[PDB]
């Protein structure tokens, strides 16, 4: 991670995390299961469904991705016909 | 710094000129040829290799010169001979039996009858018999005897076809040239030059040969008895 | 090591290094190796006659000085040529093409002591 750039002096972001991850506005990160396209003839339908299912990240990985991304990717996006707009918020979280 | 050559002498002279040796160093100063340097001080005796060279252009006919002395030359392995004709003398490469007080002929005339080949005589290849031993042969008419000069070495005339003479060099290679190329008859002096025995490692230093390197090098594929066929005949005639 | 700050004179070199000390040349080298000195190259000191010269190296202390008036080209012209040219123009014979009568020199290469090339040392 480049904490201080050379041109603008700003903090940069890694593009791998934005290529293979998705941040919901509530702080959660969404990802794909590793190996969901490799050797599908060798795996059971239940395992294939487990691989095709999306998954969340835990607190340490989420904080790592927040450190590796800038503030532009932590904004509120109002997309037209966004499937994850219902998941952008959190409800009934009694902490 | 770049050095200048010692060969800055345009006027031909019979007196020996001093020459500056250089051991393998090019004009830059770096070694180009290894094993050269530190010989005996030598002078240079300018040799006239264009044998048929008349004094004045008014009489371009054949001419006869007289041998004054056959002397030793440290620059080449052969012996030199001073020949005088008219108002000038010149150094030539003496033949095997050329002694003081001989007459040498220099001719450029070719006739239907072959001439009797003596030793000091120099006729074009088209006028010599078919089995004549020759030396100081030429490549082009008037170019100069670049070929056979070494002591004892001599080539042989093989045949003359279509006004072109074929000779055979000491390397057993055939050389085709025009028949108007002048050539001296006989063998070059000092026929016993190959039989000389360097008595010690100091005679090589006298001659100016530095010792070989001490690095041991393993032989490669180049080594071994390569029985290669004789290369084709080297022709110098320009066929249009 | 050797010294670099000291001056490089003729005393500090080999026998083949003989550099002059600043004197001017007085001739050339002849035939048999000797030096031929030319009498035209040696400076001829032109000394005047100081017999009846009533002037001393010092002046009277009570003698007054003068205000500094450095002599200029305009002042010299006004002193040597302005009266002559003025009289000539008043008489009506002024010739702008010929100015040699007033002291002007067209080309310096004619006379002995020229001013721009400075042929004379002193």
């Amino acid at each position: 991670v480049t904490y201080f750039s050379s041109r603008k002096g700003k903090r940069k972001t890694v593009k791998a995390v934005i290529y293979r991850f998705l941040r919901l506005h509530s702080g959660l990160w969404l990802r794909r299961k590793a190996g969901y396209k490799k050797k599908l003839w060798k795996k059971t339908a239940a395992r294939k469904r487990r691989l095709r299912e999306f998954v969340f990240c835990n607190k340490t990985q989420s904080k790592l991705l927040d450190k590796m991304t800038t503030s532009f990717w932590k904004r509120r996006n109002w997309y037209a016909d966004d499937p994850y707009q219902k998941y952008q918020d959190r409800t009934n979280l009694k902490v | 710094a770049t050095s200048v050559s010692w060969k800055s002498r345009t006027k031909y002279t019979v007196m020996p000129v001093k020459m500056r040796k250089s051991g393998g160093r090019n004009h830059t100063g770096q070694i180009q040829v290894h094993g050269i340097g530190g010989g005996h001080k030598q002078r240079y005796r300018m040799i006239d290799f264009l044998r048929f060279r008349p004094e004045h252009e008014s009489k371009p006919g054949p001419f006869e010169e007289k041998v004054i002395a056959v002397r030793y030359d440290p620059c080449r392995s052969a012996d030199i001979a001073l020949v005088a004709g008219g108002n000038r003398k010149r150094w030539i490469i003496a033949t095997e039996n050329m002694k003081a007080g001989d007459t040498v002929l220099n001719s450029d005339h070719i006739g239907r009858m072959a001439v009797a080949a003596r030793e000091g005589d120099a006729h074009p290849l088209g006028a010599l018999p078919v089995g004549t031993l020759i030396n100081n042969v030429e490549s082009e008419p008037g170019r100069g005897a670049q070929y056979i000069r070494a002591a004892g070495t001599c080539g042989v005339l093989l045949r003359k076809v279509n006004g072109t003479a074929i000779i055979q060099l000491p390397s057993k290679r055939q050389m085709q040239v025009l028949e108007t190329c002048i050539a001296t008859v006989g063998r070059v002096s000092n026929v016993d030059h190959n039989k000389r025995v360097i008595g010690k490692a100091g005679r090589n230093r006298w001659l100016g040969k530095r010792p070989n390197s001490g690095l041991w090098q393993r032989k490669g594929g180049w080594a071994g008895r390569k029985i290669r066929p004789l290369p084709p005949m080297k022709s110098y005639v320009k066929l249009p | 090591g050797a010294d670099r700050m000291s001056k490089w004179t003729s005393k500090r070199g080999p026998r083949t290094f003989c550099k002059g000390r600043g004197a001017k040349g007085t001739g050339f080298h002849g035939r048999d190796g000797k030096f031929v000195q030319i009498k035209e190259m040696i400076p001829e000191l032109v000394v005047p006659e100081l017999a009846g010269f009533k002037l001393k190296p010092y002046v009277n202390y009570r003698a007054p000085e003068g205000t500094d008036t450095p002599l200029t080209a305009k002042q010299l012209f006004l002193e040597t040529a302005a009266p002559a040219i003025e009289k000539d123009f008043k008489a009506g014979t002024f010739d702008p093409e010929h100015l040699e009568k007033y002291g002007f020199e067209p080309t310096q290469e004619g006379k002995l002591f020229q001013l721009y090339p400075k042929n004379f040392p002193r």
Binding site: - | - | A73, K74, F77, A81, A82, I85, E86, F89, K90, P96, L99, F104
Partner: protein, 159 residues
Amino acid sequence: LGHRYVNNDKLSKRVRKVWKPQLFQRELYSEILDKRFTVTVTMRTLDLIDQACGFDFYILKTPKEDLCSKFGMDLKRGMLLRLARQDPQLHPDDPARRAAIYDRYKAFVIPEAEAEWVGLTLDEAVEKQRLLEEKDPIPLFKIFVEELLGQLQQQALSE
């Protein structure tokens, strides 16, 4: 002068490469200057000449930034000066041929005040300006004589 990837693969080695043009020693004839120059030209030069339909046409049309040749700029300057001066030394025995040659290049006629400054570099231009402005210092005698004449004329007219 640049770099290249061997085997045309990015992940392979990077190697410095110098691409050079194919030079040719050709003889080109000019109509305005009437001389055959043995010049080292390229196939692109010959193609530009054939496209401009003439050596002089190509020289007069392609500017300095497209010529990139001091010799080409000198040729252009020479032919421009010749066109601006109407040089009779082109064909002293053929005035009709000279006029016919000068007519077909009428589109590039530049006056003399600018025809002698096109094929010059900065150093050459400064040298030319110095040679033009090189004037010997006039003696102060002349200036003082002029001043005195002015004062005398003033005193003569004020009476």
